[PDB]
Design a protein around this ligand. Structure first.
Ligand SMILES: *[C@@H]1O[C@H](CO)[C@@H](O[C@@H]2O[C@H](CO)[C@@H](O)[C@H](O)[C@H]2NC(C)=O)[C@H](O)[C@H]1NC(C)=O
Lengths: 43, 47
């Protein structure tokens, strides 16, 4: 994924940060943003 | 052995403060001992 500067505040005892679906969102602080992906259609 | 801690200012006289206050972890000591009873320690006053 892509490491991004995070505006979220992490407590000193917190290492990882998970959003909905219990998937990794931020890691000690850098936000994880999966790089661009999608579908491809042919007309 | 896990200690979670929190501190708060209260303005009652003799009661248990109501409301909600989450306690953040303080320490996680890797000791691993058998504990079944405990006692508190308090300091007295002399003059
Ligand atoms: C911690 O120590 C206590 C002793 O006060 C243990 O309690 C006894 O355990 C034995 C088994 O080893 C039993 O036969 C006794 O009946 C228990 N007595 C009581 C009052 O509970 C306890 O098992 C120990 N715990 C660990 C994890 O070792």
């Amino acid at each position: 994924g892509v490491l991004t500067e995070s505006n979220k505040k992490f407590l000193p005892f917190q290492q990882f940060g998970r959003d909905i679906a219990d998937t990794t969102d931020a890691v000690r602080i850098l936000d994880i943003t999966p790089c661009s992906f999608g579908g491809v259609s042919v007309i | 052995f896990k200690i979670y801690s929190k501190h708060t200012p209260i303005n009652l006289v003799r009661d248990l403060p109501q409301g909600f206050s989450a306690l953040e972890p303080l320490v996680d000591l890797p000791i691993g001992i058998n504990i079944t009873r405990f006692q508190t320690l308090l300091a007295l006053h002399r003059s």
